[PDB]
Design an enzyme around this catalytic site. Sequence first.
Site, PDB file in Angstrom:
ATOM      1  N   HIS A   1     115.511  71.291 153.812  1.00 22.31           N
ATOM      2  CA  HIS A   1     114.929  70.297 152.859  1.00 22.31           C
ATOM      3  C   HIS A   1     114.722  71.104 151.706  1.00 22.31           C
ATOM      4  O   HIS A   1     114.412  72.328 151.610  1.00 22.31           O
ATOM      5  CB  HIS A   1     113.515  70.118 153.406  1.00 22.31           C
ATOM      6  CG  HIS A   1     113.668  68.676 154.404  1.00 22.31           C
ATOM      7  ND1 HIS A   1     113.295  67.692 153.945  1.00 22.31           N
ATOM      8  CD2 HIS A   1     114.107  68.867 155.727  1.00 22.31           C
ATOM      9  CE1 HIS A   1     113.464  66.834 155.113  1.00 22.31           C
ATOM     10  NE2 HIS A   1     113.723  67.598 156.266  1.00 22.31           N
TER      11      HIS A   1
ATOM     12  N   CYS B   1     114.063  65.071 146.690  1.00 21.32           N
ATOM     13  CA  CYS B   1     115.535  65.591 146.178  1.00 21.32           C
ATOM     14  C   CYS B   1     116.050  66.087 147.627  1.00 21.32           C
ATOM     15  O   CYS B   1     115.721  67.022 147.834  1.00 21.32           O
ATOM     16  CB  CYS B   1     115.369  66.155 145.008  1.00 21.32           C
ATOM     17  SG  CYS B   1     116.847  66.972 144.686  1.00 21.32           S
TER      18      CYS B   1
ATOM     19  N   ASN C   1     114.319  73.856 157.494  1.00 27.22           N
ATOM     20  CA  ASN C   1     114.722  72.427 157.769  1.00 27.22           C
ATOM     21  C   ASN C   1     115.601  71.873 156.869  1.00 27.22           C
ATOM     22  O   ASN C   1     116.133  70.817 157.342  1.00 27.22           O
ATOM     23  CB  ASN C   1     113.491  71.807 157.945  1.00 27.22           C
ATOM     24  CG  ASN C   1     112.275  72.281 158.407  1.00 27.22           C
ATOM     25  OD1 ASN C   1     111.022  71.910 157.786  1.00 27.22           O
ATOM     26  ND2 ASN C   1     112.352  73.045 159.602  1.00 27.22           N
TER      27      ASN C   1
END
Lengths: 264, 265
Positions: free
Chosen positions: B188, B223, B186
């Site tokens: 991330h 983050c 995704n």
Amino acid sequence: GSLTEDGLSYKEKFVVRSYEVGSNKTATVETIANLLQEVGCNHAQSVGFSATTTTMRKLHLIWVTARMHIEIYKYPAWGDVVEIETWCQSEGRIGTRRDWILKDSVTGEVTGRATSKWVMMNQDTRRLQKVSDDVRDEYLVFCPQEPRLAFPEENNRSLKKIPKLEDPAQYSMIGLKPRRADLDMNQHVNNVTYIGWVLESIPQEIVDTHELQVITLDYRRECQQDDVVDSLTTTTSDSQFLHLLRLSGDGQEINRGTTLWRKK
Amino acid sequence: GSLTEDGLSYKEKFVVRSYEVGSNKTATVETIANLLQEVGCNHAQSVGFSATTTTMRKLHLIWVTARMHIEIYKYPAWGDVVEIETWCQSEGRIGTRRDWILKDSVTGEVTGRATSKWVMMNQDTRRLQKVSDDVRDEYLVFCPQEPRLAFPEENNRSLKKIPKLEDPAQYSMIGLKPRRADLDMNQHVNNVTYIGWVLESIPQEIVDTHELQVITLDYRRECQQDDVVDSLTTTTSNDSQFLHLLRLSGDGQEINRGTTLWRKK
Ligand SMILES: Cc1cc(C)nc(N)n1
Ligand SMILES: Cc1cc(C)nc(N)n1
């Protein structure tokens, strides 16, 4: 995994893991490069090595990668089984060559292939040199005697001369430092990290709208644990790019390569 | 891999790969954290998840990690077989808990264990929320009804409050940016990358003369791809204890905080 009937090559199946895929739900080129490296390690253990030979150990000599070329036709999806067949071969006094064939475990079709050039080099000095005495005969029994190339075709992408990227570069990713996960069991930066660093300068738009078809990478110097790399890229064209990895400080070239990308 | 006879847990064996080991020829804590994440993904896929439920997809809600605790007794060597058994469990309106048991495939002994706390978050606004009644009855059928904890103990270190590292930090690793290999499907940053970043401030001498026994990590913020992290560490202690803090290099926004325990070899 296991050696083939003749014992002149090794086969091994892998199930594609969830953390090994990208946004398109297919294995990343770094995952593929890791699986080739893993199947090559198992082939070396299955034939009695640890990779080094008897004369290579009494003399401080190791095998070091000089060039890696990977062509992918289909990236295996998350959950798929992929069988890689690897084999060694002598290349005269220059060194050793290791080839791979990626196949689909369900369809049996070739979904990718790779080749790599290896050179001698002293471990305690980092020279080059070459020998033919016990060394050539030690691995000649584990290699097919007749030529068996993954990329046979006369005048192919795996033997082309890579030029040096001229300044200024079109794209760049600066300040790349390796971490403990990037190092191997000998505390050296893994060869797969250089592949990931070369692709760090490729624009995100190119990645999201193209698939990496071919990647040739020439290895010139080893990035050390306390070194910082600058990845540089320029479009030369399907899309072709010229790459250059150099130390952030002095500008010492550690790697140079080319990538080819097809539209989805 | 496959579900157990009752179908209230999942088991899976792994062969430790060459690129997954450190200087001591044993699997790194990041490799272990990846295998726990992989066995958890296969348990979710085998029960009909993808790991959102029917009501979670309709309401745009996802599962996010709030805390990860890993205790290792023996790290499997390069070439060894390791079997991990994972299972889910409800924790009231707070969220879900996922536990793991690492075992040796040859001796059958427990070589490590882990626990993790999960919370419900709106996919779009990133707002945390309490587990509603309809969602709880969808995954309850896949969880053992009676309490089954990997760390049952009266006062285990998996439920301790982690303090914030005071400035100045004893050790630090500055300028840590994630790359494409650190991102997931995704886009991330993978939860395992934070573990590797926390250990980046640990001195090389400590690593070369000690083994990581326990690692507790609280997840406060995530983050992003274009963010830069600063890893900070301070010794708090034969055994060595450290307090950790991950923060954005710019503003100093805390993304993670934790503790590590190390024993002499
Ligand atoms: C051919 C080669 C390869 C590497 C990684 N280093 C050196 N010095 N030479
Ligand atoms: C509990 C938690 C964890 C993470 C990664 N982000 C948020 N906002 N909350």
